[PDB]
Design a protein around this ligand. Sequence first.
Ligand code: PTY
Lengths: 75, 85
Amino acid sequence: PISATMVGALLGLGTQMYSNALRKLPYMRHPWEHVVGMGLGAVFANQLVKWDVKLKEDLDVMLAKARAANERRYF
Amino acid sequence: QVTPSPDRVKWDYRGQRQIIPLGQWLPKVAVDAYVAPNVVLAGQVTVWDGSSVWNGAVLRGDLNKITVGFCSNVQERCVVHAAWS
Ligand SMILES: CCCCCCCCCCCCCCCCCCCC(=O)O[C@H](COC(=O)CCCCCCCCCCCCCC)COP(=O)(O)OCCN
């Protein structure tokens, strides 16, 4: 379906084209750079998803400790 | 008397250079401007974004500045020159 790899590749390709356009160059001026951008975008999107999972995992434990410290009041 | 030189170039394999600098006067062409291959730009010439200079035109800025503005066109075999005053 719509995987992080595909979203990232599309974003990387879009980044290269947007960069070319901003510089008033043809969209496909250096195509190997478009390939590089697709690769980097895919890598970055996958890494972001994994980091999001890990971040939620750490926030869970930290909220657990906060809750325990708060519950110590009613002892 | 007409005394020739034996070393004068009869055939130049490079053809006519499109961009002719003149000291520090270097013609400036925008990256999104079309300049036909056989056009000659010399000296103080500025060709701006979206403009176009077509086959056989000559733009010689050796006495004053020459400017082709945004989205303007100088068409085939035009000659654009300038004077001191
Ligand atoms: C697998 C597809 C993607 C692979 C990309 C290459 C491998 C990754 C290595 C890092 C690539 C990063 C991007 C390289 C270019 C960065 C920007 C350089 C542009 C620049 O200003 O300097 C140019 C140097 O050219 C250069 O830097 C390029 C030099 C030669 C690289 C081009 C060959 C890429 C091969 C693609 C697949 C080949 C298939 C067979 C293996 C000089 O610009 P200039 O005067 O030379 O001309 C340009 C005409 N506007």
